[PDB]
Design a binder for this molecule. Structure first.
Ligand code: ANP
Ligand code: MG
Ligand code: MG
Length: 237
């Protein structure tokens, strides 16, 4: 039941990464967004949280954007990847998808066909939608990217009794984190500015196109800052 020595390393090797289309961002991420982990992009208004969630669904459809050790992750495991986008804010825009696709050399329609978008209006729908993700897989959908944009808006606006909230939001995370592990996929969640989450960034604005993404929590990477801009191409630099 316990894994030791070489097994630990082999287990860590089944972890693949998704590129953000930003050199700096990827750099700070240790190579890219990690599968089997939950990565949070908390940030200020118009900081780009949503843009990254979009760019992420797009890059998922460009095979050269999935970095993984072939000796530990067969092409068959990352074949025909599909993303699940749980939209809590109603900020999903299929046109931003088309545009990002365009500038990346991807069939925008392919992205839309391989991305499941669930509109959630309350904390119950949110949690439930994240729970059905398994069924989706069970239906033969190779879910490899999950997006909860955002993660804490519903829970906040619904809850003194702030214990029920944490107790519930924690239950959501449990499902999310487990999801990431058993199905070897990347989990992304946003937060406008208490809960688990292996990676945590805080984004902000700079000079126009400019954005400053600060990585302040991860189990094996140092705190660092990546700089990128948002343009009609999506995330870039
Ligand atoms: N087509 C585009 N061309 C250039 N920039 C764009 C385009 N679309 C969006 N942007 C940029 O994206 C910024 C907002 O991105 P967004 O991902 O929605 O931030 P956000 O953190 O999710 N905002 P919020 O949910 O309110 O906290 C804008 O203010 C624009 O500068
Ligand atoms: Mg995990
Ligand atoms: Mg947003």
């Amino acid at each position: 039941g316990f894994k030791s020595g070489i097994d630990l390393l082999k287990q860590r090797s089944t972890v693949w990464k998704l590129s953000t289309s930003s050199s700096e961002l990827d750099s700070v991420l240790g190579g890219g967004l990690e599968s089997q982990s939950v990565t949070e992009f908390a940030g200020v208004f118009g900081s780009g949280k949503t843009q990254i969630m979009h760019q992420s669904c797009v890059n998922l459809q460009n095979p050269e954007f999935l970095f993984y050790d072939e000796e530990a992750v067969s092409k068959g495991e990352v074949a025909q990847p599909k993303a699940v986008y749980i939209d809590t804010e109603g900020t999903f825009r299929p046109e931003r998808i088309m545009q990002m696709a365009e500038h990346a050399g991807i069939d925008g329609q392919t992205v839309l066909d391989n991305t499941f978008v669930a509109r959630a209006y309350n904390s119950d729908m949110q949690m439930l939608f994240a729970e059905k993700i398994e069924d989706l897989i069970q239906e033969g959908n190779n879910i490899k990217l999950v997006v909860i944009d955002s993660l804490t808006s519903t829970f906040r606006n619904e809850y003194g009794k702030l214990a029920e909230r944490q107790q519930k939001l924690g239950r959501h995370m449990a499902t999310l984190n487990k999801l990431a592990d058993l199905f070897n996929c990347v989990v992304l969640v946003t937060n406008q500015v208490g809960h688990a989450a292996t990676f945590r960034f805080f984004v902000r604005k700079g000079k126009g196109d400019k954005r400053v993404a600060k990585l302040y929590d991860s189990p094996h990477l140092p705190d660092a800052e990546a700089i990128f801009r948002i343009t009609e191409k999506g995330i870039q630099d």
